[PDB]
């Protein structure tokens, strides 16, 4: 028993992290087969950040302008190209540690693990969610750019996020591994702010089920509710609409605990209206929304990789 | 910026996890050089748990009674011995992935990462603390036994914990890698409960500094306090005594932020007496005590491994 913010084991991603240097800027890159993927803003200078002309900047660059280091080993760059906001550096050595992998674009509300890196070296791993406003609330310092987010399914690493930058709000923004930003953000130093975020209702519900599985049951009330009446209340507290797909997705937790989803919705309704009155749920004084239903199932059933 | 519960990258420990089977019981083992370390209760049966005679049970066991699997590869056991509550199985193949490592016994209040495993396969990684009552608040299911906790310093993995069992309270107990339990607990099915836990005051203070570094400053008041007056208040709220060693250890955070430790103590005093009044700190509605000062420094300075 117990419940923790649990990340995927990071060993498969660790063997893919390299350091990419271009002029004075260093950041991280991802090495899969004989390609290194990293943020294109590595080719910016301090004179370039407000409105870089990325095509023009790249043109003045030779392969030899790119210094790629895997640990202490230099990898020789033999090609370079730009795909959306990502650079692809073809190198003359394929990564012998390339895992089975794919590139996916995740949906707001989904979660992934982040292997934060600096100068090509791993520093820490933590679990994140794609917020409804397409930001993530990560922990990243200067030089973290190129750190990646991933899920693991079985033996296959699905890469979903590459870190590009921090917004003035202190939240973080980036791209899928095709270089397309999540949200309306751009890789230049300009005014751009996140939309108002919202609470991932289906995740909050998944977490309430995890509480019940762990024996924390005081918030369960005697009522039910309709989907429509639940959503009118939740709207007021800045919760996202719960759809029938969300309900279906909560099926495994409802079956395990015996609590119908609409019944759990009535308990959450009461928590929103009345608060928790000093009590805690799974050691938290707040409703948590960064566990998906699948995360709860996986952590309370022991899925390994 | 940002602040997360951040674990150490787990790749070095992943390459050390094996499956150990003895009769019908399976659990995890740690493979370093040509030795596999695992909990001795693997040699128990369902008829043995109340008061196992471990010496007698081990005697009736041959090397061939131990099935060790690294992935799908069987490792042949060529010796076996018992050290305190841990089994040491000498195998005929040394782990080619053995990292530089040592075994340490940690102090209450310190933190470590846990690589939770099932049947020798990694499932997730999260960060934990040794509670003052020598339990840990982990996330572990049946078969997690033998999962280990560790810190990483530079290139060296310091192993500090091996998971042995769950208490009826749902908290977890285990040993150092010499097989000596943390706390008064024993590896048998008998009545044994944790002492009353307490809050790790020096950790709470480290977390308040992390808040300030991240720009969350509303709880800072205009007062100072003496160490003695602070501890009289903290005693009431079940906080541990803050010692001068704790103050010295907070030196780097005080220097970085400009806030004297005793000044930060006056702000924490007010939070204990008045509560937070609906406000949050680093996204939490509760005071967090599972970040050590070193964790804060490392996460707000980017130390890599
Ligand atoms: C050129 C461009 C696109 C404007 C840029 C500039 C700096 C960086 N940041 C690098 O740390 C970094 C950059 N190159 C190597 N390191 C940081 C970053 O985003 N500050 C933004 C701060 C608001 C104003 C725009 C820039 C950063 C800090 C913390 C976590 N994440 C990233 C990222 C992008
Ligand atoms: C023989 C002995 C020492 C009594 C024992 C028995 C079972 C286990 N548990 C194994 O899961 C397990 C054991 N062997 C393979 N798996 C579980 C465990 O501790 N239940 C305790 C529950 C209270 C009463 C005593 C046993 C476990 C569950 C969840 C997380 N951690 C461990 C551990 C030790």
Nearest atom in ligand 2 to the alpha carbon of residue B27 is: 15
In this structure, the answer to whether residues B202 and B278 fall within a common structural domain is: yes
Q: Which residue is catalytic, options B41, B80, B164, B246?
A: B41
Alpha-carbon distance A209 to A211, whole Å? Answer: 5
Alpha-carbon distance B37 to B43, whole Å? Answer: 13
Which CATH number belongs to the domain containing residue B116 in this structure?
2.40.10.10
Q: Is B64 a catalytic residue?
A: no
DSSP string, B258-302: ---HHHHHHHHHHHHHH--TT--BTTBSS------HHHHHHHTTT
Bridge partners, A150 (sequence order): A113, A159
Q: Name the residue with tokens 């001795």.
A: B40
In this structure, the answer to whether residues B270 and B163 fall within a common structural domain is: no
Q: Which two tokens stand for residue B71?
A: 């992935």
Nearest chain A residue (CA) to B214: A170
Nearest CA to ligand 1 atom 16: A143
In this structure, the answer to whether residues B222 and B189 fall within a common structural domain is: no
How far is ligand 2, taken at its centre, from the CA of residue B77, in Å?
24
Q: What is the number of other CB atoms lying within 10 angstroms of the CB of residue B191? A: 5
Tell me what percent of chain B is helix, strand and coil, each rounded to the nearest 5: 25, 30, 45
Q: CB B9 to CB A6 under 8 A?
A: no
Residue finishing a domain among A47, A67, A99:
A99
Which CATH number belongs to the domain containing residue B295 in this structure?
1.10.1840.10
| B contacts of A123 (beta carbons < 8 Å) | 9, 298, 302-305
Q: Give me the domain span that covers residue B158.
A: 1-14+100-197
Q: Which two tokens stand for residue A292?
A: 């998906």
Nearest chain A residue (CA) to B216: A170
The domain tally of chain A equals 3
Resolution of the solved structure (Å)? 2.1
In this structure, the answer to whether residues A272 and A167 fall within a common structural domain is: no
In this structure, the answer to whether residues A229 and A209 fall within a common structural domain is: yes
Q: CB B7 to CB A7 under 8 A?
A: yes
Bridge partners, A18 (sequence order): A29
B14 touches chain A (CB under 8 A): yes
In this structure, the answer to whether residues B215 and B191 fall within a common structural domain is: no
Residue finishing a domain among B72, B99, B126:
B99
CB-CB contact of B203 with B289 (8 Å): yes
Q: How many angstroms separate the Cα of A17 from the Cα of each of A123, A137, A144, A288, B250?
A: 11, 22, 12, 31, 33
B29-42 per-residue burial string, b: 16 or more CB within 10 A, e: under 16? bbbbebbbbbbbbb
The answer, yes or no, to whether any atom of ligand 2 lies below 6 A from the CB of B40, is no
The answer for A 87-146 residues in CB contact with B (under 8 A) is 115-119, 121-126, 128, 137-141, 143-144
In this structure, the answer to whether residues B3 and B27 fall within a common structural domain is: no
The answer, yes or no, to whether any atom of ligand 2 lies below 6 A from the CB of B8, is no
In this structure, the answer to whether residues A105 and A7 fall within a common structural domain is: yes
| B contacts of A4 (beta carbons < 8 Å) | 5, 126, 128, 137-139
In this structure, the answer to whether residues B128 and B264 fall within a common structural domain is: no
In this structure, the answer to whether residues B203 and B294 fall within a common structural domain is: yes
Minimal CA–CA distance to A16: which of B165, B127, B198, B9?
Answer: B9
Alpha-carbon distance A285 to B37, whole Å? Answer: 39
The answer, yes or no, to whether any atom of ligand 2 lies below 6 A from the CB of B188, is yes
For β-strands B156-166 and B101-103, DSSP reports them as: parallel
Residue finishing a domain among B99, B117, B133:
B99
Q: Is B164 a catalytic residue?
A: no
Exposed/middle/buried for residue A73 (C-beta within 10 Å: 0-12, 13-18, 19+): exposed
């Amino acid at each position: 028993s117990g419940f923790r913010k649990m990340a995927f084991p990071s060993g498969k991603v660790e063997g893919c992290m390299v350091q990419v240097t271009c002029g004075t800027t260093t950041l991280n890159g991802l090495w899969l087969d004989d390609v290194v993927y990293c943020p294109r803003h590595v080719i910016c200078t301090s004179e370039d950040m407000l409105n870089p002309n990325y095509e023009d900047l790249l043109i003045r660059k030779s392969n030899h302008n790119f210094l790629v280091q895997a640990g202490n080993v230099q990898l020789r760059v033999i090609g370079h190209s730009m795909q959306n906001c990502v650079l692809k550096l073809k190198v003359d050595t394929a990564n012998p540690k390339t895992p089975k992998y794919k590139f996916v674009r995740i949906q707001p509300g989904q979660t992934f693990s982040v292997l934060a890196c600096y100068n090509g070296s791993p520093s820490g791993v933590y679990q994140c969610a794609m917020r409804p406003n397409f930001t993530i609330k990560g922990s990243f310092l200067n030089g973290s750019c190129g750190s990646v987010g991933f899920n693991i399914d079985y033996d296959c690493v699905s890469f979903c996020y590459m870190h590009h930058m921090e917004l003035p709000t202190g939240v973080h923004a980036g791209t899928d591994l095709e270089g397309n930003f999540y949200g309306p953000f751009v890789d230049r130093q300009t005014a751009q702010a996140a939309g108002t975020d919202t609470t991932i209702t289906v995740n909050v519900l998944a977490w309430l089920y995890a509480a019940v599985i762990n024996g924390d049951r005081w918030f369960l009330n005697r009522f039910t509710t309709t989907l429509n009446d639940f959503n009118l209340v939740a709207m007021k507290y800045n919760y996202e609409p719960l759809t029938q797909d969300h309900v279906d997705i909560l099926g495994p937790l409802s079956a395990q605990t015996g609590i119908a989803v609409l019944d759990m919705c009535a308990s959450l309704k009461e928590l929103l209206q009345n608060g928790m009155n000093g009590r805690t749920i799974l050691g938290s004084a707040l409703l948590e929304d960064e566990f998906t239903p699948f995360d709860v199932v996986r952590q309370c059933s022991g899925v390994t990789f």
